[PDB]
């Protein structure tokens, strides 16, 4: 009458390796666009991912040069790289080493497997090697960070960067790409108008959905609570 | 021009109505080029009047 | 610099970047470094700017709170040319500018270049505030027309307000002041068009 | 010809699609021409400019 | 029928009007006058001769 | 009407006058959505028949 | 100033830079030959009897004056004659409506107006005259970006543009790609296009982050992939602004046309962040710094890295021969190159002297005009070109750019004469399949007598040997081109006269974009950006993507 | 620093036009929280937020939706316009109902309505018509209702009159997101929220509800 339905999540609907659909299933009247507007907004501002940061190639000192044997300038080797996701799974930053020798393309496949780096895409090329005795190793530093950090705001106090042969690359620590709410008629039987919120999120992979949507609503009720306490002045 | 150009610019135009109506639009560009040029001289010449 | 928009400022102001700003206000912040104590000499506030610490930057606020700056574009026509604005400061590399002030100037944000100045001497910035300030030159000195006209946005969007279709939603309903209309539209059970009797006072 | 490619594709017709706002998701009312226009970019850069 | 750097990604074409005369080289002034300039012309016609 | 407001009230509520007007036809003018396609120049049919 | 009647298919109406000289920097159109004597003649197919047939003459200005000249736009109904029975056309300068018998040609394409660079518009004839000029104008200042990528929109002029300059490689002799490499590309080439002198496999040399005139960078990245087979006049490597030998000048994206809360007010524009995240705008600029070592008359100014009064902060990206390092991050106000410049008569004031006296420092004799980097400009080093005056000596440095350079001229006519080594002997191994076959026994032998086998008496026999004389002269060839080059290398330079050495650095800076850049459409809808909005704000349609 | 660390809002600063009529200016908020928060809470209170107003109301004389009743300068729909901001404040009784049987010569305010001990009649000032001098007469059976957030007349037999329903306190809700500014970090929010309401709550506890609503929507998913 006066005090409310609660939202509760019901079922993830898993489509793709990256797409994702969920919907939350008792929702209150206009509290649909409230919660879908604002889960939106959370989603795609400030979640936390796993992008690259600092890739040491071997016998690279600067991005503008090319390297001999392989088929792309090094920058575009840096291009192809920062879109490389990684789900790191047991720490904040870490190093990955990718060595391959020999014709052939590149994917993110010949990354050194560690336990708690889980590559989500292994068929994300890289590189192109284009010579038989052609080689390549790199660091390949992997850090969990959050929103958009370009290399320009990343050198501080240059953080001890005295190897020249170490390349910056910028970050985008964001696993989605597009989330779209929608709303609709919940069929619950004692009942005419409520809601059904039905997100339907797009990450690159590193993301559970889930833990998308749990981390969203625990960020904006934790922001929140300057209010319920208010504290007047 | 006594035959004129009949079409909107929705319609698209052909190659002789956008070369006809291209001499009034460098006539226009022309004029706005020297008019500068003689109007920076005129208030010149009338602050120092006064 | 090149000039943007920005319109949230009031009229009177200006976006200055740090940068501009930081190097025009420099002897103010060797006087204001040697006024806290920072730095004893000019050799050290010399030193201290140019490394741009984190406490130049709380000084520059202070230094540049209520000192007009005077914009100005470069074929000056009349006196509305060049008007004076208390600047805020932006990170960025661009001269944020009020859109009520570009029909004076003759503006446009296509490129157009606008000369900054600074007022030093304590007449300067009094002149520069009692009869070059934005908001006193409301009117053009050739007419008395207003010069400070909405342009090209804000008077479609008031247009586009003010107006009144045949059958929008809550045609009819009557209506118990102007905020009960603003309350009616952001809840959307009422057109921005729709012929009803309020009461106005 | 563009509006039977925007029928081969399941795009509307006149080119004019529902876009939401950003800020509140509210639907704009009155709905707005989106696209694909091939934008440049020239060198009167700020950096060289300031 | 196409280049096998057409057969890359073949632009699609609204032209209407069958085209008769290719779009001839675009720099033929600036390279047919300096080679009219320096040439062994065995007649006193074009250039150092 | 911001000549009026000059004219009756004085500087400083026209000073306040205009940046609210122009903080109101923005805000307006984006819920307007306001576009312009290519379906929003109506040729006239009485056009063939005129030429 | 103005446009005349006589200009159509000879000058461009549209493409003149407005401002002072509007109508005298004039540009030529697409087609507009010129004459024996000079007069710009165009190109027109004779209309005969009542068909156009497609004797493509070209008339001048003069001879245009008489005929009756049709449209571009005149229907054909696929014999040649016009579908009406009275087509319109022009004259003397006046336009008219002529019957179809009257005519006596008929315009070759419908770009034959306006210029190549005003043929790039899509819909020119839909916008005013002045929008096309100011978009034709602003077209040809585009700065060639990160990575460039199509005109969605194009026009068809997009590839003969890009292959008529000279800013991508394209094939000469058609044939299978036998190797690709970041900076090199090496075409084997088909049978019957081959030249039977030579074993041909051409190699096409890419031209690697070089700047611009205006400081971009002019670089050339390789389009195909190996064992792919091209053809005659098939693009290689695309240069800058292009794309599969398509003209790219700019980047396309999803855009809106509605007014967004005043941010875009006049010609301001939004512009998601989503963008910046993507580096679509992401121009690389490549500037050159220089640091002349002069012969002062008080003596001259060295190069060294212990210069006065600046402490390790700043000398630890130098070398110890004075020279940055390639590839060090410089930024503002850091040395590149120490000069030490010296000088007499000091004569200190004396609060100098007691500040000296205080901390025991020396007076410095050499002054300091070290080549530092200009304030604001933070890039990369990726090149330093060390020139020396024959008879100075050159340091650590130069000897390592010459023992660099050395190697790599040697590796590289090493590399001609191995890579065409593997082609002369493919092509003895082709010869020694036929009269005299080998099949084991050439493979038995080594390469020493490949090109001396016993054949039967045909003229593969004697291209054994014309292909072995071939080898014999590439191997006097590259030990005489080897000399050469080493000379032509570690020879002295013809510099100023006064001048020592000459140390040219060259930073790389990649510039963002950012709130006051200019950008623009291709119909003159410009614009500086002012907001660099988030993805959450930028609106968006009813399946999720931000425009 | 890690990636669940937040900007919070410190000083939020609630300075009021002396009665009802906040402006709750705070700050600093991550880049773009200070449209989530200020949409949510706009869209919280202006929507659905609880409450009781007047929904219907039956004249003594007058049945007809649009008519005279004698003695009163204003119509009947002026009267029903006096009516819909009447702030009524009710206690735990869900659907009171009230008369006003009042003849007299001057002014009807609400101080002359009948008194029930569960029901707050705010403003007693509040004038809702005016009688003539006479012996004029005006009784109606005024009925509150509880309700969630603002029902117009259009959405729903004596002949009695409907009123438009705003249970909901807030009259105008407004926030104003401005650029903060940290002494490194350079974009950050700042909420200017500006709120005035009908009286029978202040907006401190408006925005404290506004905040438990949607707090307790959350409840499932938070930890
Ligand atoms: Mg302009």
Redesign the interface.
Known sequence: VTEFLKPRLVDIEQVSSTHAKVTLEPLERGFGHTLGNALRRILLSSMPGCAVTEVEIDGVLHEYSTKEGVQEDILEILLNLKGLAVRVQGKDEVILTLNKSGIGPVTAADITHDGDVEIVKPQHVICHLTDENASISMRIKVQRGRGYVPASTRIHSEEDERPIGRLLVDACYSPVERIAYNVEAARVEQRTDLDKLVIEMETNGTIDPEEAIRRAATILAEQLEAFVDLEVL | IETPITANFREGLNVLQYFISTHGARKGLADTALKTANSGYLTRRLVDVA | ????????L??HQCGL?K??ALELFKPFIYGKLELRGLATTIKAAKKMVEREE?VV??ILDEVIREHPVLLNRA?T?HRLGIQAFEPVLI????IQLH??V?AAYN?????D?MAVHVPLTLEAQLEARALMMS?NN??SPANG??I???????????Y??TRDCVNAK?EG?????P??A???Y????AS?HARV?V?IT | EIKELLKLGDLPTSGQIRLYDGRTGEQFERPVTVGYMYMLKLNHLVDDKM | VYSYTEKKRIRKDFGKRPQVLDVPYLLSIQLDSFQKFIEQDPEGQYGLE | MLNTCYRILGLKPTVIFADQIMYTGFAYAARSGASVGIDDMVIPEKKHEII | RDVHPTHYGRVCPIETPEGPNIGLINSLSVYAQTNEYGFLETPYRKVTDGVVTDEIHYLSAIEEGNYVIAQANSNLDEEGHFVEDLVTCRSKGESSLFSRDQVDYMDVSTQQVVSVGASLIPFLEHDDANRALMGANMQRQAVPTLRADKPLVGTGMERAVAVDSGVTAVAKRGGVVQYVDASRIVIKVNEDEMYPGEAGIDIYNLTKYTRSNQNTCINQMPCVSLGEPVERGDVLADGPSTDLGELALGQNMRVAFMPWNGYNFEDSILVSERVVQEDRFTTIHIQELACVSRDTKLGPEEITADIPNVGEAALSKLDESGIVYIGAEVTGGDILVGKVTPKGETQLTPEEKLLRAIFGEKASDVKDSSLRVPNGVSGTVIDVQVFTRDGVEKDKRALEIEEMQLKQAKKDLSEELQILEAGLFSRIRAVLVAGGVEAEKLDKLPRDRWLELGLTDEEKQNQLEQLAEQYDELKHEFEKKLEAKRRKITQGDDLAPGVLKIVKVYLAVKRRIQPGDKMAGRHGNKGVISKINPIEDMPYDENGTPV
Do not use: N
Not at chain 3, 91 to 94: N, V
Not at chain 3, 107 to 111: E, I, L, M, N, S
């Open positions: 610099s090149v000039i943007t928009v920005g319109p949230y009031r009229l970047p940068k501009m984190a930057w709380d074929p026509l990170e960025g590399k661009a859109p009520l570009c503006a446009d944000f296509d490129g270049q908001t409301i009117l027309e207003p400070i006209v909405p342009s090209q946005d804000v008077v479609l969007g008031l586009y307000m809550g309903m009557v209506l118990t002041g905020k009960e603003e309350r009616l952001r809840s959307g059970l921005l009797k009461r």
